[PDB]
């Protein structure tokens, strides 16, 4: 009795809502991102005795930063040369090197240069993947995507790379983290904590698996949707890194062709004898990791065997491991890696896998726009840490399930990293009762 209304300010309660998120930058940069925004130092506090539901499928900031990655790529690629006048008819014979069938463009053509008087004859070096065959005589050839879109050369000195990015909350909005180790991608966390901004998430572009990423806390974690057994993509997050060594062994000769102030870059000549580019895997780490992954996956599926095959059909972005290293894009044969089976009941030896490289790459989510990678001189070596897998499943039948790699959609790769965070809106104006009146 004798209760009256009172109001309170600074109330600790929140709702869940969409918002626009702020981003951070780095001191050193390539030089919209190169000097902006700010580069703060974050801190973290633990929300004791707080339980909150999380869901890595429904959360919105993944799509937000997907749009941000697209917009940054477009703004970076906007002040660049358009390669339209290269769409003329190519006459290729391709017999200059010791072996020709590997690369198969070595292609003469006419180009206007610096006078607009009359086109002059030039020749360059190209890969047969980027070359398509015109009708009639086989020696006639065309560029691959010019029947569909315009092709832009990337300027080499503004090259974009996985710079770590921190996502800052705006004022009045809080970010929740769920520091629990065995979080399953959905459900209630009882280990809630808050930050001002996230850690250094890198824009990693890869297919069939992901790399240069974070690592799990306990053992290997499996994240998947649970609306139905019919799933698009299942994420596997490793607790232990495996090392990959990639190499393009040959040196290349960059040559420049002048088109106004632009200067088109092409390949002149490969130095020395031709060797095919390849990657290397520690065999014991790979097969032990596969055994651990399969014997952990059979928790979900009770009595059926587990068997792996490589993917079938589609473009090269899903049949092969594709990624970027340096300035060069690699497509790696993964047939030998995924040939295992298991019944349902430290660095010895090395698997080598063959690769192919191509210069004209479509946008990694979309067709109707393509970009031309510039040639990179010299031999290229790379070392990376693979942190997880993106898998899909077949139907199969009784006694046997089947899992094969996939993951052509680039958004699920960033969904594999931003599973922790969630954005909430603060509602600090909770009312209350009290045993007190107001002065009259």
């Amino acid at each position: 009795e004798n209760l009256w209304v009172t109001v309170y300010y600074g109330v600790p309660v929140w709702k869940e809502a969409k918002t626009t998120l702020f981003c951070a930058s780095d001191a050193k940069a390539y030089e919209t991102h190169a000097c902006v925004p700010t580069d703060p130092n974050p801190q973290e506090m633990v929300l004791k005795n707080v339980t909150e539901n999380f869901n890595m499928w429904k959360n919105d900031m993944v799509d937000q930063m997907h749009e941000d990655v697209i917009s940054l790529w477009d703004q970076s690629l906007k002040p660049c040369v358009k390669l339209t006048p290269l769409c003329v008819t190519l006459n290729c014979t391709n017999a200059t090197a010791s072996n020709s069938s590997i690369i198969e463009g070595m292609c003469s053509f006419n180009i206007t240069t610096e006078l607009r008087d009359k086109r002059e004859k030039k020749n360059a070096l190209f890969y047969k993947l980027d070359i398509v065959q015109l009708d009639g005589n086989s020696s006639q050839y065309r560029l691959i995507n010019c029947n569909t879109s315009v092709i832009t050369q990337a300027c080499p000195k503004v090259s974009f790379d996985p710079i770590p990015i921190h996502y800052c909350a705006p004022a009045g909005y809080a970010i929740l983290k769920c520091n629990n180790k065995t979080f399953t991608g959905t459900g209630p966390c009882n280990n809630v904590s808050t930050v001002q901004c996230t850690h250094g998430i890198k824009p990693v572009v890869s297919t069939q698996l992901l790399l240069n990423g974070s690592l799990a806390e306990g053992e290997i974690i499996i994240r998947s949707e649970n609306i139905t057994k019919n799933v698009k993509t299942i994420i596997v997050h490793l607790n232990e890194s495996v090392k990959i060594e990639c190499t393009r062994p040959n040196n290349k000769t960059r040559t420049s062709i002048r088109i106004p102030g632009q200067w088109f870059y092409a390949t002149g000549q490969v130095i020395g004898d031709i060797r095919e580019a390849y990657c290397n895997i520690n065999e014991s780490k790979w097969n032990e990791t596969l055994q651990r992954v399969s014997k952990k996956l059979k928790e979900y599926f009770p009595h059926k065997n587990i068997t792996f095959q490589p993917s079938s059909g589609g473009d090269l972005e899903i049949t092969t491991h594709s990624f970027n290293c340096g300035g060069e894009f690699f497509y790696c044969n993964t047939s030998s890696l995924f040939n295992r089976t298991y019944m349902a009941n430290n660095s010895t030896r090395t698997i080598t896998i063959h690769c192919r490289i191509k210069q004209i790459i479509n946008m990694w989510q979309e067709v109707g726009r393509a970009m031309y990678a510039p040639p990179i001189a010299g031999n290229i070596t790379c070392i990376s840490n693979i942190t997880g897998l993106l898998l899909t499943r077949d139907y199969g039948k009784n006694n046997t399930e089947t899992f094969r790699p996939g993951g052509g959609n680039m958004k699920d790769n960033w969904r594999s990293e931003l599973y922790k965070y969630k954005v909430v809106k603060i509602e600090p104006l909770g009312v209350a009762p009290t045993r007190c009146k107001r002065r009259v």
């Epitope: 949707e225 139905t228 972005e317 899903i318 959609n409």
Partner: antibody, heavy 122, light 107 residues
């Protein structure tokens, strides 16, 4: 608004390889999966397989992995079946269907195409 | 794997009345069940998805319900145009189809 036109069909000779085509018109072509369903006369429907038009990823039924093939062209947004080695039991009404799906899972079908009947005999 | 047994094969009613079709699942499919109306030759139309939700543009006289491992399609105001085939679909797993059921004129 959305339409799924189908072309090819009629009578095909025994033992040959046949091709069906579909054209989608009024929606974002990369967003929705496409399934291929058929109905034999006197029998219920059954699924042959499905295709992702974004990356060209197929998936096939267990009994017909060797005879089927799906692919697509993204610029003319056109989808193609190839079926090899036609047999007499393949007499059926064939449809493409668009599939509604979430970010992680697939769900019910919304639209059915005009279809393409196939009569196999020599 | 999953076998949708639609029941019965044929239902008979006078126009305007109520009619009820059953679909029996072989095992648990949660509520990943849809119901479709099949026209006399044309493209079938989605009636109901998730076992109780009427789809967009569908007339309101249609209704559907779940009872665990059994699903129910009910038409309250059965029209002359509605004397056609209806069939039940599931998508909890790999995709299967029932036999369908023809609604004809009672006499």
């Amino acid at each position: 608004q959305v339409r799924l036109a189908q072309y090819g069909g009629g009578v095909k000779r025994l033992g040959a390889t046949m091709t069906l085509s579909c054209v989608a018109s009024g929606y974002t072509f990369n967003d929705y999966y496409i399934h291929w369903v058929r109905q034999a006369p006197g029998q219920g429907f059954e699924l042959l397989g499905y295709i992702d038009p974004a990356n060209g990823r197929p998936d096939y039924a267990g009994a017909l992995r060797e005879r089927l093939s799906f692919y697509r062209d993204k610029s003319m947004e056109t989808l193609y079946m190839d079926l090899r080695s036609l047999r007499y039991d393949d007499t059926a009404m064939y449809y493409c269907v668009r599939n509604v799906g979430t970010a992680g899972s697939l769900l019910h079908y919304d639209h059915w195409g005009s279809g393409s009947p196939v009569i196999v005999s020599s | 794997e999953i076998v949708l047994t639609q029941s019965p094969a044929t239902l008979s009613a006078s126009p305007g009345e109520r009619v009820t079709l059953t679909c029996r699942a072989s095992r648990s499919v949660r509520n990943n069940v849809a119901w479709y109306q099949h026209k006399g030759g044309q493209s079938p139309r989605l009636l109901i998805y998730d076992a109780s939700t009427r789809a967009a543009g569908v007339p309101a006289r249609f209704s559907g319900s779940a009872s665990g491992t059994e699903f129910t399609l009910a038409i309250s105001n059965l029209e002359s145009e509605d004397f056609t085939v209806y069939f039940c679909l599931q998508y909890n797993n790999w995709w299967t189809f029932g036999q369908g059921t023809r609604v004809d004129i009672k006499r």
